[PDB]
């Protein structure tokens, strides 16, 4: 997921611009559904809900707009239990046996012959949460005579989330939006960026529900098993249930027990920009990094940023510097609408030339003792604009190639915190044979997929509606795309089709600003409103997304009733 | 897999007709490859091999033709090992601990980041064979501190297989074929049917390598676990490894230690026909059942036959009765060629009318509290020809319906050994609602697929070659097809495409006979010779299969050189 | 005392619900969601109630991908029954403001209204309308679903592992 909040300094106008871009499922019950709720004198909010949710999770009202991206802060921990000898369902708490709570559950299951029969099993809870079977993680972590494992998720006891979004839906300014977020501290697993009308600064925060552990606790409470497996569960607390001293802590300004207190949670306000692309809070704004927040939130200057994060901030800086090929140096609504669809490919932009200079001289190779003709491959890529646009030629070859390049010592210039957007860089001359190996394979995969090496991405990347393949643009984060359209389908399986169940991709998109006349929102629901292939709304929105025509979503009564496709009907029944 | 052997009584000529119809993989190394091996003074054989195999597995020479179907005979067993206390890698054998031989193995593994590292572990053998994790079978069967399990496959010690096919390739008559099979007792997991030149009788046998246990032994050796899991592993010897009296026995005419003696393995000679369609030896010929062989070969009349088996024998009887619509009453090469592609559907021919009569009056229904209009479905199925030919209309509706009918209490006339082709039958009137449920679902699935209910099968069932969809015919054994074209693809995901990795289907087919001029053979390799999309032999054979045009394969020298597409070349090299 | 929502649709079918109270808002929102996505939603309530196995078979995988991943129906059912128990729903509801309790009540009623419509006829949702897992739901069910959305960061990721945690 990506998001921007642009301040008045970055827009030029009296209000900022909000860009919401969650990368989410295209099918299934967690898919977004776009709607506006208008409750007489109580709320008028538009945006998007998971199917099944009754309030707006990402959207805007006449006063604020916001979005979310998945946070790097871990939201759960494990607890190792020292079992009472003879009693594998009891555990010790400071030398005191405690009964786990049993639950005997029966589930009817249709047998493949037709009939439906009961299957029952007894499961258990500790005071930390449900017991968890960790043999899959590692066989040595089974539930044995002396050892067992529970999982604690802070959101298990977080009943405040829905109340929060509702309050946000009704909020009358950014200030109130921020205040709501602080009082509730409920946001379960996401960052938040909001912009407010008549507010100069855009808002960023990882202010929500997060497990609270101290550095003293981490090194003293991690069990031998926790040590041994830590690397598979980075920053996840793996503590000794035996000791009460190893329970999650409560701050003086903690909203919930065991949760990190409000003052020790990352936020930032900027009149230029804030953004996130799924890395830690650290680089909320490149110019003013954030540091010193609890380790569970992730690394803050010790880890390289993902290619997508580097692409995102580069886009923000180059916009405001006026060096990105659009007009002016302001993040206006109109311009942001273009740039976020632009489909620039970071890996290409930064490393393609380095790669080709190194491996295309000459263009006839020997790879694994086999002759390979890379004249076409080399020339197509050299000619390619490093974008994933509909008419981009060669873009898919790069995908198949780049995602196969071995990363072990690929870059000669390592990550530097003072240059977080441009490091690591510098293709290792030594990687030449590995690079040629990866390219050979790419040539072969595109070959047997039946697409030409210089095929226009629009034919490779598509969504099918009404029997016709709508051409698409964008790609996967791994390649350093910001505009995300990431298929699960192998290229040999009829190209990068978006018709199945794609990896997290552009889903609900909004570009929201507050001119003098009132909120303006431009939106996409990439996959369309309705999962019913028969529905008029199975493919219309997708057709607009393919054409890159942003929907101006009506918000005022006049705009709604004035809309060319205005239909109204009222439903009622007794309570 | 299906196969027919017709004797001179059935064919009414000098020799019989052999029909070989393995249902097998369309891709991968086990797929078939058609070729002829002409070795000076040594062998002249034609037929088919798995990729990587050097001798003909199914085929013919100047004198004999044969095929194989997978046999019901279990080829393995388990052994419960009682472990030694403190020494879980040693098992007791008659009071004395016996150490399991270790093998420490290291496999290089490519990591998702490009680098290659080792993963290592230490696996084990008992004297019975390799140790085997059975927690997946049942949690209680885990390699515990007290007990462990080993698997034995008699073929593990079977080294006579290649020689046997090699000798069959050279065999000079049916009697010689028979004697080789009897001498070698090596056939690993298949039935065998053969026809010879100037031999009146057709041959059936399940003679090969088969575990040897006595009924007395299985009563004394089956462990409590073996009893408990016995129904999930029907006729699999789950024996006690601690007692040496439980070791597999060796008869006086037993070719291999632990295998069954040659005289106690089922075989049959008939001048009319033998056939098999994957059911046990029992019904090699309907008029003369085989009984009185070891349990391990499978049920001899104590189980309902499959629908395909009922279809298979029915086809053979009705051919010889001259009641199948074809000319005459003889199983001649030419008639057999047409007959085996006719795509009759047992379930439709036997149960469609009863189902339609039961649920189609009236045709507007309530299903799960919901109004369902089934008039079109009912009418299309009434009009349908109960076949899966290219232009059969509604056949796919039937597929989606029948495979969803709950089988519990479906038939009111139970299976009778006296009448194995017509029992079970009698659609239960009490199943009306479940049948309506199944039909409702079928109408919906076809609806999603975008095919009309009355679509010709050819547009639903297809192979794609050179960008074009070749209409196919046939179906899956579950509906009681004999002609097998059985997609793994869900109807909603683009019809019954055969372009993926379909289920066991028609692969290498052959109809072999022996007129006075010499062996004649008509063949198909349905997926074609080559797995390369660039090859002209990737889709040629498939084109022929779609058109139903059997290929007369040249066999003699004049035939090979006289062929319209004859190209020869020579390859030579040192050593 | 009746639920009453005005549903205004515009380009792309985007519904704009207009209502006098929170309950009625929920009612319209519940309705339009079902009207456009019945099959996904219905399947999904099997998930949160732990009723997948009865309808779809225990050994099949979840139809749709989500925050829950795609475990086996049998394991999914146990996870949700165990973690999203009645007590958990009782504890979740106790915390809510009156207006939300009402909105969710409406949401369920509105969803149920559409189920009655779909069962009655029409061509929409041809894929699943006749199936038994297309059925009315309760407010408590919508709360199950809401509660499930929060677990994405922890429990949801270990659903199969929670469904199989038992002693030796």
């Amino acid at each position: 997921s990506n998001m921007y909040g642009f301040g008045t300094a970055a827009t030029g106008e009296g209000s900022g611009v909000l860009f919401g871009n969650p990368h989410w499922y295209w099918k299934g019950p967690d898919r977004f559904y776009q709607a506006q709720l208008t409750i007489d004198g109580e709320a008028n909010v538009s945006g998007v809900s998971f199917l099944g949710l009754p309030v707006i999770q990402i959207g805007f009202n006449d006063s604020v707009a916001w979005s979310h991206t998945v946070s790097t802060a871990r939201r759960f921990g494990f607890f190792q239990l020292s079992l009472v000898q003879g009693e594998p369902t009891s555990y010790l708490r400071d030398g005191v046996p405690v009964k786990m709570k049993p639950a005997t559950i029966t589930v009817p299951s249709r047998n493949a012959d037709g009939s439906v029969s009961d299957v029952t099993r007894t499961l258990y809870h500790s005071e930390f949460g449900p017991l968890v079977n960790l043999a899959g993680l590692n066989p040595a972590l089974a539930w044995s005579q002396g050892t067992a494992f529970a999982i604690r998720d802070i959101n298990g006891e977080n009943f405040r989330t829905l109340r929060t979004w509702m309050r946000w839906n009704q909020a009358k300014s950014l200030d109130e939006f921020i205040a709501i977020q602080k009082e509730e501290a409920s946001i379960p697993w996401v960052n938040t960026v909001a912009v407010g009308r008549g507010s100069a600064k855009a808002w960023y925060a990882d202010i929500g529900a997060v497990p609270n552990v101290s550095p003293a606790q981490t090194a003293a409470c991690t069990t031998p098993f926790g040590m041994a497996v830590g690397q598979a569960l980075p920053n996840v607390p793996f503590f000794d249930g035996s000791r009460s001293e190893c329970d999650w802590l409560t701050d003086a300004d903690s909203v919930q027990k065991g949760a990190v207190g409000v003052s020790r949670m990352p936020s930032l306000q900027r009149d230029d920009y804030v953004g996130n692309m799924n890395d830690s809070y650290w680089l909320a704004n490149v110019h003013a990094p954030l540091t010193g927040y609890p380790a569970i939130f992730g690394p803050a200057g010790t880890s390289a940023q993902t290619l997508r994060t580097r692409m995102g901030h580069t886009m923000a800086l180059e916009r405001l510097a006026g060096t990105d090929g659009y007009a002016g140096n302001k993040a206006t609504s109109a311009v942001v609408r273009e740039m976020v669809l632009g489909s620039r490919v970071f890996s290409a932009e930064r490393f393609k030339d380095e790669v080709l200079d190194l491996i295309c001289t000459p263009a006839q190779w020997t790879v694994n003792g086999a002759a390979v003709d890379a004249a076409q491959a080399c020339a197509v890529l050299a000619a390619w604009d490093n974008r994933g646009r509909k008419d981009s030629r060669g873009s898919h070859l790069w995908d198949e190639f780049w995602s196969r390049v071995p990363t072990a010592s690929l870059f000669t210039v390592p990550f530097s915190a003072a240059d977080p957007l441009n490091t690591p860089r510098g293709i290792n001359a030594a990687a030449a044979d590995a690079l040629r190996q990866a390219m050979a394979t790419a040539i072969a995969r595109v070959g047997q997929s039946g697409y030409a090496l210089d095929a226009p991405r629009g034919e490779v990347l598509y969504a099918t509606r009404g029997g016709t393949r709508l051409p698409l643009y964008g790609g996967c984060g791994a390649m350093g795309y910001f505009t995300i359209t990431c298929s699960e389908n192998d290229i040999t399986q009829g190209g990068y089709s978006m018709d199945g169940q794609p990896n997290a991709s552009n889903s609900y998109m909004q570009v929201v600003s507050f001119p003098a006349s009132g909120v303006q929102a431009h939106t996409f629901l990439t996959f369309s409103l309705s999962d019913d292939p028969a529905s008029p709304h199975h493919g219309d929105y997708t057709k607009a997304y393919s054409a890159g025509q942003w929907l101006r979503v009506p918000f005022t009564e006049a705009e709604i009733t004035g809309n060319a496709d205005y239909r109204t009907a009222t439903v009622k029944e007794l309570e | 897999s299906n196969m027919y052997g017709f004797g001179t009584a059935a064919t009414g000529e000098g020799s019989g007709v052999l029909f070989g119809n393995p249902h097998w993989y369309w891709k991968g190394p086990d797929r078939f490859y058609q070729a002829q091996l002409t070795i000076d003074g040594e062998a002249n054989v034609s037929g088919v091999s798995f990729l990587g195999l050097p001798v003909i597995q199914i085929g013919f020479n100047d004198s004999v033709a044969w095929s194989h179907t997978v046999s019901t005979a279990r080829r393995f067993g388990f052994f419960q090992l009682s472990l030694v206390q403190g020494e879980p890698t040693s098992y007791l054998r008659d009071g004395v601990p016996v150490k399991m031989k270790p093998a420490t193995i290291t496999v290089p593994s490519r990591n998702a980041d490009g680098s290659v590292s080792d993963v290592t572990r230490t696996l084990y053998h008992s004297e019975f064979g390799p140790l085997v994790n059975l927690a997946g079978l049942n949690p209680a069967l885990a390699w515990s501190q007290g007990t462990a399990f080993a698997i034995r496959d008699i073929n593990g010690e079977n080294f006579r297989t290649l020689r046997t096919w090699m000798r069959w390739n050279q065999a000079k008559s049916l009697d010689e074929f028979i004697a080789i099979q009897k001498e070698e007792a090596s056939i690993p997991w298949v039935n065998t049917v053969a026809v010879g030149r100037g031999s009146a009788k057709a041959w059936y046998a399940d003679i090969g390598a088969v575990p040897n246990v006595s009924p007395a032994q299985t009563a004394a050796c089956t462990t409590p676990f073996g009893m408990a899991v016995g129904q999930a592993l029907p006729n699999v010897p789950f024996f006690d490894g601690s007692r040496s009296e439980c070791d597999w026995l060796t008869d006086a005419d037993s070719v291999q230690k632990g295998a069954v003696g040659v005289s106690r393995m089922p075989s049959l000679q008939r001048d009319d026909y033998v056939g098999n369609m994957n059911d046990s030896y029992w019904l090699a010929n309907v008029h003369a059942p085989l009984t009185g062989y070891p349990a391990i070969f499978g049920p001899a009349g104590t189980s309902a036959q499959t629908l395909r088996t009922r279809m298979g024998h029915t086809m053979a009887l009705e051919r010889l009765a001259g009641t199948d619509g074809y000319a005459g009453n003889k199983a001649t090469s030419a008639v057999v060629r047409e007959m085996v592609l006719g795509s009759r559907v047992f379930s439709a021919e036997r149960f469609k009318d009863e189902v339609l009569d039961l649920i189609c009056t009236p045709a507007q229904w309530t299903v799960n509290g919901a109004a369902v209009d089934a008039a079109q479905a009912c009418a299309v199925l009434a009009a349908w020809d109960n076949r899966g030919r290219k232009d059969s209309r509604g056949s796919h509706l039937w597929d989606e319906f029948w495979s969803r009918v709950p089988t519990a209490s479906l038939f009111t006339v139970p299976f009778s050994a006296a009448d194995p082709l017509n029992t079970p039958r009698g659609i239960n009137a009490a199943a009306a609602d479940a049948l309506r449920q199944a039909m409702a679902t079928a109408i919906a699935r076809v609806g999603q697929s975008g095919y009309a209910l009355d679509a010709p099968r050819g547009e639903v069932l297809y192979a794609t070659r050179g960008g074009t969809r070749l209409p196919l015919y046939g179906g899956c054994g579950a509906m009681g097809y004999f002609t097998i074209t059985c997609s793994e693809n869900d109807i909603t995901q683009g019809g019954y495409s055969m372009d993926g990795q379909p289920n066991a289907s028609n692969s290498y087919m052959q109809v072999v006979s022996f007129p006075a001029s010499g062996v004649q053979a008509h063949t198909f390799l349905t997926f074609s010779l080559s797995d390369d999309p660039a090859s002209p032999h990737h889709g040629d054979y498939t084109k022929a299969y779609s058109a139903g045009q059997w290929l007369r394969v040249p066999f003699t020298e004049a035939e090979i050189t006289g062929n319209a597409d004859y190209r020869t070349a020579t390859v030579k090299e040192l050593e | 005392s009746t639920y009453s929502a005005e549903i205004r649709r515009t380009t792309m079918g985007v519904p704009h619900i207009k209502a006098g109270n929170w309950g009625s808002a929920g009612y319209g929102f519940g309705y339009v969601q079902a009207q456009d996505n019945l099959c996904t939603m219905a399947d999904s309530f099997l998930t949160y109630r732990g009723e997948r196995s009865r309808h779809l078979g225990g050994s099949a995988q979840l139809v749709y991908n989500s925050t829950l991943g795609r475990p086996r129906n049998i394991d999914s059912d146990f996870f949700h029954r165990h973690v999203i128990s009645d007590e958990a729903v009782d504890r979740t509801m106790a915390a809510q403001p009156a207006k939300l309790l009402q909105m969710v009540e409406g949401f369920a009623a509105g969803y149920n209204r559409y189920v009655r419509e779909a069962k009655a006829g029409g061509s929409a949702h041809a894929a699943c309308r006749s199936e038994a897992w297309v059925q009315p739901i309760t407010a408590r069910d919508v709360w199950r679903r809401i509660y499930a959305a929060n677990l994405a960061g922890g429990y949801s990721n270990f659903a199969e592992a929670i469904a199989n945690a038992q002693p030796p």
Binding site: S1, L137, L233, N278 | - | -
Partner: peptide
């Protein structure tokens, strides 16, 4: 405990 038999699960929500 053998680290080589450790099978990391899905941790990134989404």
């Amino acid at each position: 405990f053998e680290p080589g038999r450790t099978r990391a699960p899905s941790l990134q929500v989404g």
